[PDB]
Structure 1
Amino acid sequence: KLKVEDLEMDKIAPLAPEVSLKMAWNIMRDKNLKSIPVADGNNHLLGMLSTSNITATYMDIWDSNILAKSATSLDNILDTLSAEAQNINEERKVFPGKVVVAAMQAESLKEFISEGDIAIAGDRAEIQAELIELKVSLLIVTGGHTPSKEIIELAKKNNITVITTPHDSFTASRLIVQSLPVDYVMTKDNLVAVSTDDLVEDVKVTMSETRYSNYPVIDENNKVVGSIAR
């Protein structure tokens, strides 16, 4: 009897779970993939990423602490904003608060911005200093202007991560969402894969139900070996 491993399959390089949506989307376009598997370091299938996932994330109610819940990393934020770090709290993995644009006056920031927040700000030293004083978990300086040495020093002392992006505040706000790791967004449950072990006749029965265009293929050990079209 003919098994799935006897079928020719599409080759498919899985995404790591920690890769940004930005990186993931660039890969999906580059290969013309509507969806792509996500796998761990041992190549075990973790989930699947598609533009259905990505759009739902963008269109559906934004959790305020989404960076925290996704455990979005600094490297993800830095690549996504084409940003450079002027100081890093190297003992922090996770940015716990909400993302806020520091559009206000310095004296007013207290009311909107609190400890652990991610603050997007411009090139005003006065504003930066106050955000540092408020213990934002992350200060994102927009406009491409790296803060003064004084500000950098204040941040070193307080262990505030400070980065600078060339993008203005509107664009940075749009971009930051694309920092999210794929594992936060992907389909995980009732992902339908097929095993190299499975009989084709049985797989026809399983494809009958589901209606998807593509199914990742796994081996005896749950490792991602490819995908096949219906």
Structure 2
Amino acid sequence: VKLKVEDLEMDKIAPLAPEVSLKMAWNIMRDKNLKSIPVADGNNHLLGMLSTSNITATYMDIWDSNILAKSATSLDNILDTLSAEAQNINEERKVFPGKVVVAAMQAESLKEFISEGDIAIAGDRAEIQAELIELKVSLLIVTGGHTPSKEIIELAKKNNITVITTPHDSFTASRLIVQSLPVDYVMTKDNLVAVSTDDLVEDVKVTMSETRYSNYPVIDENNKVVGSIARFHL
């Protein structure tokens, strides 16, 4: 009998969940030396492929802010990525709709640069933080590990502004934050070339030579993601 895909020895790795961050994804991938990994849903049906090339394009190619918006990046992803902790959470805002801005300026001229719904990265100055609150940023990120005073926190409570503290400095926090993005915003979703447990190895061969992908997700006869295969397993 000719060989089928299940007859091979492949990478039986658990697919990623679509809500996990680029950062969580890269750690999982790097630690298995994977060039790409499947994404699946709660029922373990194929949603996507995620390549290191996708991650990289996301860093190397961005004019676009509201990126946090378009990706619907969640607060948990930002806290994890910035090793941060929340002092107040607007529990009814799931999306941060504006752009990321380093509040470099002094208090009076912040309005020329920072709008309602923006994500502002500020330092340990109460004056700055109060003005960012009055401007109704969707998220205040305070740097240097300098947890804000109770007065500022109560003002965020009053106005329902999400406020968090990271130990990182503004530069570092600016480099990190894009690692927060969920995989599902970055992964490939269309024209997925998948392979069945029961396809003949000789058929898969043909199929694989048609494209140049590092890996192909393997799906069982019940349509569930079982792992992935590469040219190397042939």
Bin the TM-score by the shorter chain.
over 0.9
The answer as to whether partners of 2:45 and 2:223 remain within 8 angstroms in 1 is: yes
Aligned-residue offset at 1:26: 1.1
Aligned-residue offset at 1:186: 0.9
Question: TM (normalized to structure 1)?
Answer: 0.96
Question: TM (normalized to structure 2)?
Answer: 0.94
Aligned-residue offset at 1:205: 1.4
1:176-225: per-residue Cα shift (whole Å, max 9, x none)? Answer: 01000011111121232112242333222111211323211012333210
1:154-191: per-residue Cα shift (whole Å, max 9, x none)? Answer: 00011000000000000000000100001111112123
Where 1:210 maps in the other structure, the secondary structure is: coil
Counterpart residue number, 1:148: 149
Stretch deviating more after TM superposition (186-195 or 83-92): 186-195
Cα distance in 1 for partners of 2:60, 2:126 equals 35
Q: CA RMSD in A?
A: 1.2
Counterpart residue number, 1:136: 137
Where 1:2 maps in the other structure, the secondary structure is: coil
The answer as to whether partners of 2:85 and 2:164 remain within 8 angstroms in 1 is: yes
- The answer to whether 1:89 aligns with 2:90 is yes
Q: 5+ unaligned residues in a row in structure 1: which ranges?
A: none
Cα distance in 2 for partners of 1:187, 1:37 equals 10
What is the identity percentage for the equivalent residue pairs of Structure 1 and Structure 2?
100
Cα distance in 2 for partners of 1:221, 1:116 equals 44
Aligned-residue offset at 1:138: 0.3
The answer as to whether partners of 2:35 and 2:214 remain within 8 angstroms in 1 is: no
Stretch deviating more after TM superposition (184-193 or 106-115): 184-193
Cα distance in 2 for partners of 1:213, 1:79 equals 29
Q: 5+ unaligned residues in a row in structure 2: which ranges?
A: none
The answer as to whether partners of 2:198 and 2:221 remain within 8 angstroms in 1 is: yes
Cα distance in 1 for partners of 2:75, 2:40 equals 21
Where 1:75 maps in the other structure, the secondary structure is: helix
Stretch deviating more after TM superposition (104-113 or 207-216): 207-216
Any runs of at least 4 consecutive aligned residues in structure 1 with deviations exceeding 6 A, and if so which?
none
